[PDB]
Write a protein that binds this ligand. Sequence first.
Ligand SMILES: *[C@@H]1O[C@H](CO)[C@@H](O[C@@H]2O[C@H](CO)[C@@H](O)[C@H](O)[C@H]2NC(C)=O)[C@H](O)[C@H]1NC(C)=O
Ligand SMILES: *[C@@H]1O[C@H](CO)[C@@H](O[C@@H]2O[C@H](CO)[C@@H](O)[C@H](O)[C@H]2NC(C)=O)[C@H](O)[C@H]1NC(C)=O
Ligand SMILES: *[C@@H]1O[C@H](CO)[C@@H](O[C@@H]2O[C@H](CO)[C@@H](O)[C@H](O)[C@H]2NC(C)=O)[C@H](O)[C@H]1NC(C)=O
Ligand SMILES: *[C@@H]1O[C@H](CO)[C@@H](O[C@@H]2O[C@H](CO)[C@@H](O)[C@H](O)[C@H]2NC(C)=O)[C@H](O)[C@H]1NC(C)=O
Ligand SMILES: *[C@@H]1O[C@H](CO)[C@@H](O)[C@H](O)[C@H]1NC(C)=O
Lengths: 50, 113, 49
Amino acid sequence: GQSKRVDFCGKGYHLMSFPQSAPHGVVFLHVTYVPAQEKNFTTAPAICHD
Amino acid sequence: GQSKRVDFCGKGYHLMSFPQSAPHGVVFLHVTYVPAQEKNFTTAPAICHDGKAHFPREGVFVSNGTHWFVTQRNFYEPQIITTDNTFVSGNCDVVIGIVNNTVYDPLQPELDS
Amino acid sequence: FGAGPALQIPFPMQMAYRFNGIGVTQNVLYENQKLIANQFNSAIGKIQD
Ligand SMILES: *[C@@H]1O[C@H](CO)[C@@H](O[C@@H]2O[C@H](CO)[C@@H](O)[C@H](O)[C@H]2NC(C)=O)[C@H](O)[C@H]1NC(C)=O
Ligand SMILES: *[C@@H]1O[C@H](CO)[C@@H](O[C@@H]2O[C@H](CO)[C@@H](O)[C@H](O)[C@H]2NC(C)=O)[C@H](O)[C@H]1NC(C)=O
Ligand SMILES: *[C@@H]1O[C@H](CO)[C@@H](O[C@@H]2O[C@H](CO)[C@@H](O)[C@H](O)[C@H]2NC(C)=O)[C@H](O)[C@H]1NC(C)=O
Ligand SMILES: *[C@@H]1O[C@H](CO)[C@@H](O[C@@H]2O[C@H](CO)[C@@H](O)[C@H](O)[C@H]2NC(C)=O)[C@H](O)[C@H]1NC(C)=O
Ligand SMILES: *[C@@H]1O[C@H](CO)[C@@H](O)[C@H](O)[C@H]1NC(C)=O
């Protein structure tokens, strides 16, 4: 599935995972989404119109 | 509560659960929703109206062979593709799989009469 | 396939669902499909290395 638990399946916003058998264990490859190239903007809670 | 954790409380999309006492333990009856009676359709990432690309808001584009509908991803409820169903995110040049079809305007027919 | 019968879906159209699941719209994936695929392949190769 896709998990919304934070840091449960990788550093970032979880996209998917892939299992791989390893000697006496399992290795998960976690594919996650990481933001980058942030930019500053001026924000406002609401906007007053008429 | 209702859990989104996969296979945590039953095989399927969790709906609810009922506890029952048992000797030295508990028994959970997990009531879950399981899809069934699948059907294959032709799908498209987006639909190209006049110089514009339309993506489904909450759903998926399918085709019954001739017409194109927008449905929900968990139950076949085909709906006519209108402006309220989709949203515009540019032109028909960067999406691979974009399909030409008409997006019916829900306001123009009433405005013209 | 883990919550019932397996329902086929194209992988770009499934990555669109998984982008929607994190708060990012579908057009972000669809317009940047080649870049996302290249990033995924490079990440897999770097994992191997
Ligand atoms: C957005 O603005 C913040 C400040 O509000 C910037 O933080 C500055 O970063 C520079 C470079 O490291 C520092 O010299 C300054 O002292 C920082 N300012 C403060 C108040 O801490 C931040 O870099 C800006 N982000 C972007 C992406 O431009
Ligand atoms: C722009 O913001 C100003 C400041 O809040 C608004 O001006 C007020 O308008 C009301 C209604 O006429 C007056 O009673 C207040 O005295 C005004 N405030 C000031 C400081 O002059 C104005 O209405 C806002 N414009 C819009 C279109 O929302
Ligand atoms: C695909 O669905 C469309 C829309 O429901 C079908 O077109 C309609 O078919 C019904 C049943 O024969 C007719 O009464 C309507 O007049 C049709 N509408 C139009 C606008 O032509 C279409 O037949 C379906 N195609 C297939 C292959 O099942
Ligand atoms: C969807 O419709 C567009 C309308 O622009 C088609 O693009 C035209 O295709 C013709 C035939 O190949 C070309 O001669 C024109 O130059 C194209 N016009 C533009 C503005 O690009 C497009 O091919 C159609 N798509 C499909 C799959 O039929
Ligand atoms: C069509 O759907 C059936 C289930 O109704 C599925 O088993 C079958 O694989 C599909 N046919 C294809 C993909 O050709």
